[PDB]
């Protein structure tokens, strides 16, 4: 009965105690520079100790254009697909997140409420600004040039700073976590005019000649030291540490010109958010090849069924400006999507354009149970 | 006291609201039209739930048909493509009466920033004025026609989390109205050295600029599958038998260096004032100013500034300032005379000009009474 | 007869709506149009309170394209600016259905004047026909774009301090239907010849007369905060169960010195009828008609008078007399009612009879929901 | 409790028994000849006897234009403006109505229904008709022309006829009522082309060269005789001798265009009437300088917000026509306008064009307690 709701407390009051009590620290694990020419796979190894939030990685390189005559120019995604996937798995083995780099920044923008350590542009006559190019790219390679790009993403583990849901506790020896990145290469990053360019970091006539010089990265742990102790050991928030906080990604095709084209939501999951990106045959545009946008119940009632501009203009409610041409933000963290609480739900997109090898990225935000 | 019991009960209702009901926006009614043949509609809402409020999409095409002069947008732009909204609940009590600037002014308010803005960063990767929002062509060349894009949030209730001034509507047959006049070929174009106040675009071909068609969509923001318990249906009543409205007024009478002051009424709790300094038909950047301030009767100010210093204090709740408009935050310790007149709103210009005027924007909190 | 009780009660109820609401009128709609693209509109009433009537305000542009040839104003002129109006109220059932010219007729009748005219005195202070409530040139002459304003009031209460006929609507959601129906490119000028019946203009230019444009606003009138007492909402039940309706028909087969009778139906308790005889387009001063009467059948006539006669008994309700053509009855103090179909009917005895003639007939009436 | 509502009973029946039992009475209390230039404000002493109604005034003019070559016309109030201001105070010295001799009149005429006094004009073959020119004023007064005038006022104590709210019971011996009038003077009644026109009698180029040559008055007071007298002396209704039933008028400016000029009514009143008069800087349009005017509660709650011809419309149906240029009228007879009742309540006009030196002119017709 309210065995659960005494369940519920307990946990709150632990993870209280153990925001309170122990210490936060962020310290890097690990650094390589290569050229992903030669390997593009890491399995970096975290440190195990004590609960862990999540990683702060670091991600610079170095571009080179060699066509005699032509520029690349980025992609709408830019810098943000320099790593093309993250996996995490637990001292358990138990995987989490599992997404695109791209799906990720997004998330990662959508969690700060502005675009990912971004620098906001004001009047100040003081010199802030773009001073330390955190996140930055140049937006052209001309041909013979060689551009720098920083990128920055936050794999989580625990929801935010003060919720702790989907933590792990490293502190068993000989059972180690896995954090494995997979970086860009000469074949994902450069597209070629007419080709997609929803992986690439830089199009254009000069795709063909361009070639990484090198990729870095750095890898810091943000962890929590100095676990209070109690009577019966570490005071541990149990239903935090036994749930998961996971980034999924997906793609589904066949859309039809003014149909309905319906993702059902994968039941059990308890769904944050949701990112729909319309990949229309390569083509990225305004809302203008789209009717509508909803998330529907079982009963066909929609909660939120809108057009481009009106979905459009809730987002930058949230993030204080649009996501990127084709890109749709969906928020349900006070109400997480939960079949079984409402019967089956599914996120709807209706087309008013459908080219050739159309489909829609489906990029998910959700907490399920451990085990 | 049984308040502190009321409310204690009130606010307790509204979190079960919150935390049982589930939120549902919906399309209510779209509409494209030609002003030259008719600009007021009467929306009529949809009685179900707890009503929080109605977000107001506008579009329209305007052709510059002047043979060779162009025009531009004035500092309200497509903030006037609403001249004025009315709403009226189930019961026939009014709340909001107001203009389409001074809503969007409060919109804007709320949020924090411009409203439904796209801020500019440094950020390499693609965010930025993506979908054109609330949008509008800085100029309409002669022959030109441009598209503009607004949006207007009209509340009922005060926020996502306070429902105070929500109307309940599963409530008898009795229709909501949502009156809602919009610019016509009358009100959107100011000629040069005209008053641009209520005006989109202002310019030499002004004479010769019509509205090619408008439309309209009201999407309804409301609270569904409201909790039951033993008496029935759990309701926040202070939440619904409170009123949050927005209401304009215009004051004249203005001259240079004497204290001009607009008296606040009783009973209302009054959130926010926005005055603006219609010099004229000229608006200015606080330079046709002395000090602006709030004052109660026998208690002198309680913040005479110097327009910069008042424009600081707005600039810390909005981010940038909101020319002539001015804004005071009072949420937090509403003005709330008890005696008509009490408190007031003071301006004292330093220059006046001919048909000066200062239009005033109240947001408030009242009892149904 | 528990009906004393229940008229009792009514009336009582009525008294306290009266005395305890607050009267509102309030704008619903306007809209600006050309005849040529659209005519007819359906208007959506605003459901509140106890709905009384309409106000409805149309105001219209007329430009004479001819080259050299002038129109002038019909006997109805601005009356018809609307050819129609029907009202639906939220339960489905029809009120008034009638023609814009019967509507105005009945809206003078009731005010006891030319409605919302402006009366000429000799006072030396500059009271007139200062805002021109109602005003129409009185000829458009070739090239020339003249003005008009029309104004008619759809009744649902019979009165300001009647409320039979007024409608419940904070009732439902269910809508409420005001149609109307406005003249157009089509109905609004006549050519020398033609009938001017439902006309606004006629002359030599009517054919290349035109709307530039029409705009009409609607207001609605109705009573607001009604009182509340133990069992709830005090209201005058037979009041709001009663249908007070205008509405027109049409009779033919008329002969010279003939008694044509239009008989009245049953279940209806008629306030007034409004008989118009087009005589195949021409429209006179009563010298087409030998008598005007009503009769009950086996009773004989109750008012069997000669043109003239008829006419002055028009001038003691509305201080004048009606256009050519236009006979009025009132019946308001005793209004017609047979309970068997036809045991009272209109009659004319026609004097001249042309092609094509006719009797336009048009009633106020009270009925029961039933 | 139901202590007034006995004395609501009481008082209309004393009024009943009082108008049943006496006998009305209108006779001439004084008469006098005089030219303005010597002297224009009288104090006439009315006639203590019995319950005092009102006063008939009587005022006749000779109008002389000696200008060279020009004319002069009727301005829009023509001689309505013969009488400036009136003032009437009863024997305790209480203030009753002080207004204007334009809004007096105004009133008389939206009490009668009709143009006060005037002349309707018929098809009657009879001769029927301005026979006796009760209110009469040439419409110009030609260069060496003498122009003749009458015009009537009737100035109310008694609401009408048959109800005496607001009668004054004039029994008291020593105790004397006062009916101050102040009339028109060359300066007042002639203005010259472009002088704003609204308190003079005549306006044209010929202006500066007319003259009063004289002005008489006559002063009739109607009362009610032979008082009944029952077991406590008269029977009189307390609560109508002890409500001042009153006019007044005042100038409110601070108009600008599009905005909504609102006149606070000034609480405690039963407002039976107000007329709004939009001197727009001299100038007096016929509603083309109004988008529209209303009555607001507290809750910006119009009941009855109107386009000026629409509200021109509702006065058609009180006075059989409309008002001069600029003056609007609006009935509260039936629920008088009364703060205390409904929050407090406005008379608003929204300007479409405002001139130099515009204002609101407000004529107040109201009820209100006595001491």
Redesign the interface.
Known sequence: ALRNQQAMAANLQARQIVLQQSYPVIQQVETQTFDPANRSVFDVTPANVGIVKGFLVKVTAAITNNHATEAVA?T?????NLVQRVIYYDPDNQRHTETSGWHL?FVN?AKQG???L????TDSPIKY??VMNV???P?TIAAGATGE?TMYYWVPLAYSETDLTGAVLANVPQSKQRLKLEFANNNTAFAAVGANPLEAIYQGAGAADCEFEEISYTVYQSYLDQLPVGQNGYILPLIDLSTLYNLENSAQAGLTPNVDFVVQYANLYRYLSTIAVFDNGGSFN??TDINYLSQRTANFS?????????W??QT??R???????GVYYCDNRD?PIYTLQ?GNVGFVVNPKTVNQNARLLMGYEYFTSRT
């Open positions: 980025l709408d995604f830019g810098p943000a920044h923008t502005a675009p990912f971004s620098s906001m542009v600004g773009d996140i930055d790219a937006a790009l305004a809302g929609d909660t939120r069924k809108l057009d481009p501009k009106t459009a203009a930058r409610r993030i204080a400006t649009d996501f990127p041409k109400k409402y």
